[PDB]
Design a protein around this nucleic acid. Sequence first.
DNA 1: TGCTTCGTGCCAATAACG
DNA 2: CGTTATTGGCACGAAGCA
Length: 120
Amino acid sequence: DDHYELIVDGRVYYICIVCKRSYVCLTSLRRHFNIHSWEKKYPCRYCEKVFPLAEYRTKHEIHHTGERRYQCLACGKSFINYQFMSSHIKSVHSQDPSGDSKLYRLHPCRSLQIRQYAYL
DNA sequence: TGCTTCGTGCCAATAACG
DNA sequence: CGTTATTGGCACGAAGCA
Ligand SMILES: [Cl-]
Ligand code: NA
Ligand SMILES: [Zn+2]
Ligand SMILES: [Zn+2]
Ligand SMILES: [Zn+2]
């Protein structure tokens, strides 16, 4: 037992018992709760670091390999993560990649074995 | 104050089951 | 191998940090 619920205007929110963060999804509360319980460990397969969420380890491991999955479509430069790509496109191209038009391509991950999304 | 990492709704892909 | 149950990839704003 790791949560209680709160219902406001007919909307259900799941509240973590330890820190009282609220979640629209019970799956998000569970993913978050590992930060408290450390029931599940996600150790980096290249260094000593251990993370409480799978996605923190994955994004960390890409720094080890150096794969540059985020490609600017305006000039072709590639970047290790969304933030570098977004900042490049905003400052060099004066355009916002968030939604609207598709200014970048996310290539599949080939330097690690992670789940493969067919839309890439 | 610009890099660095975190965080969470959404949901597709993979794990689990026996 | 057939479904479903669960994980975790992703965006991109938030937070951390020097
Ligand atoms: Cl690359
Ligand atoms: Na968001
Ligand atoms: Zn919590
Ligand atoms: Zn590492
Ligand atoms: Zn560019």
